[PDB]
């Protein structure tokens, strides 16, 4: 007898492997939610997940990649309840689909590595920023193809992830430097291509991942380099700003409260930025390469109704 909310199902398998990421872990928790708890009626099933997704937003309010996972699972079970099976087969007809994304969204990243080959060409110095793991699997395919390139890793401050990526692919055997994020503007002229990855895509095409992907994006547009971004086909959320201000973590990005005893002072600003359509130029899906205008329409094609 589980409850699927916090850790009695969900945070079990987040300590199982750091190959599954946050939103499909919620998708893995949401598909097994109605699988065991199948209350033989179409009404309270969706009322179970509306209780369960809204407390899951309440569980971690500042991991809005989960909110994209909370978004499209409702978009999954809506059309899966469509084809009009009167809930008779649609109990089984949903769970015979069932384990799709643990067989399909797990193979997002290698399918990204199938079609993201011909971006990193011969002798491209590559600017990466933040642990967006689809980039590394694209770089895993690049080392396994023995195609020639180099790599440059920025910081990820304060999220520390840039120190991991230097250790992650030096053992793989790529010539690489870790650079500070402060030294982007004096180095970007030698840099030719640049790869990042969003935690979620907004309505105009959003980069809702890290602290300064918009900073390195607006550098690259004045450098006039193709600012690519690597993601997959389950990373879409309706949450869409008008400025570069999303929901913050807890407070406004200009706090002026004081240090009580020894409180952290680098952690006063934001941790999530926003980039509109203007500064990206292409992105990757499991559907294929995608222009920043088509990422608006496919995020609206089944979203208005």
């Amino acid at each position: 007898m589980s409850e699927f909310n916090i850790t009695e199902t969900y945070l079990r398998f987040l300590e199982e492997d750091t190959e599954m990421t946050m939103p499909i872990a919620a998708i893995e928790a949401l598909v097994t939610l109605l699988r065991i708890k199948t209350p033989e009626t179409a009404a309270e099933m969706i009322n179970t997940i509306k209780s369960s997704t809204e407390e899951l937003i309440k569980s971690i309010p500042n991991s809005v990649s989960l909110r994209a996972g909370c978004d499209i699972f409702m978009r999954f079970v809506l059309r899966n309840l469509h084809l009009y099976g009167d809930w008779e087969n649609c109990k089984q007809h949903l769970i015979e689909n069932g384990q799709l994304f643990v067989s399909r969204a797990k193979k997002s990243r290698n399918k990204i590595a199938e079609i993201g080959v011909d971006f990193i060409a011969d002798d491209d110095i590559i600017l990466v920023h933040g642990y967006s793991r689809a980039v590394f699997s694209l770089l895993n395919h690049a080392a396994n193809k023995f195609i020639r390139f180099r790599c440059v890793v920025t910081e990820s401050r304060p999220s520390k992830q840039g120190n991991q990526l230097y250790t992650l692919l030096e053992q793989k055997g790529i010539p690489v430097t870790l650079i500070v994020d402060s030294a982007v503007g004096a180095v970007i002229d030698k840099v030719d291509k640049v790869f990042v990855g969003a935690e979620g895509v907004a309505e105009s095409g959003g980069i809702i991942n890290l602290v300064g992907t918009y900073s390195v994006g607006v550098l690259a547009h004045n450098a006039r380099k193709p600012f690519y971004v690597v993601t997959e086909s389950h990373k879409f959320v309706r949450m869409f700003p008008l400025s570069s201000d999303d929901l913050p973590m807890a407070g406004p990005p200009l706090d002026f409260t004081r240090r009580t005893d020894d409180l952290e002072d680098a952690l006063r600003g934001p941790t999530i930025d926003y980039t509109a359509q203007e500064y990206i130029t292409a992105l990757i899906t499991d559907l294929g390469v995608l222009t920043p205008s088509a990422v608006s329409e496919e995020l609206i094609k089944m979203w208005y109704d």
């Binding site: 292409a282 559907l287 294929g288 390469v289 222009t291 920043p292 205008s293 088509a294």
Partner: protein
């Protein structure tokens, strides 16, 4: 070397009786075969025309506020595969003066493919007509180019048979004509 605007600017003077002029440069040294052929037939239909050299096209760009480019093919980005030579940098020089940049393209000139490498579609030419001396002992090196590519940020509109369109809208016309399987047109479905 665009038979579209060669035919179009006839009736753009004939039916609509608008008077104007066209500057015309050469695709040196390749479309200058047809560049002298181009304005001559327009001199028959007498649209105040005059031939500029390729070097002068910046110096008169401040006067002109509209350019049209007859392209050859067009991809999914809105970056189009243009005609032979000289047209990309002047499309860049047009964009810097905040000048609208026009293009014409038939619906069959569309292509559902992506420009992964620019250089795998930029085809070059010959060392023959760019210098004819052919020194074997001094023997310098020289570069021709018979394909120019432009980004979609340097283009503004697509005058087509089915309307004018955004540089970023090009997928929706294309995916109403093409499918996701045969764009990877290869027997190995890896």
């Amino acid at each position: 070397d665009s038979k579209t605007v060669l035919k179009f600017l006839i009736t753009a003077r004939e039916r609509s009786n608008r008077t104007f002029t066209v500057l015309v440069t050469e695709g040196f040294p390749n479309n200058t075969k047809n560049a002298h052929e181009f304005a001559k037939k327009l001199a028959q239909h007498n649209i105040e025309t005059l031939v500029v050299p390729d070097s002068a096209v910046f110096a008169l760009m401040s006067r002109v506020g509209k350019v049209i480019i007859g392209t050859k093919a067009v991809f999914v980005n809105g970056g189009t595969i243009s005609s032979n030579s000289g047209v990309s940098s002047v499309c860049e020089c047009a964009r810097e003066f905040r000048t609208p940049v026009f293009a014409v393209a038939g619906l069959y000139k569309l292509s559902p493919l992506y420009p992964f490498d620019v250089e795998k579609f930029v085809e070059f030419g010959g060392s023959q007509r760019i210098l004819p001396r052919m020194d074997p002992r001094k023997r310098l090196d020289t570069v021709n180019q018979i394909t120019d590519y432009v980004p979609p940020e340097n283009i503004d509109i697509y005058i087509t048979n089915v309307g004018g369109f955004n540089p970023s809208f090009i997928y929706r016309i294309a995916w109403d004509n093409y499918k996701q399987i045969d764009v990877h047109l290869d027997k190995n479905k890896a």
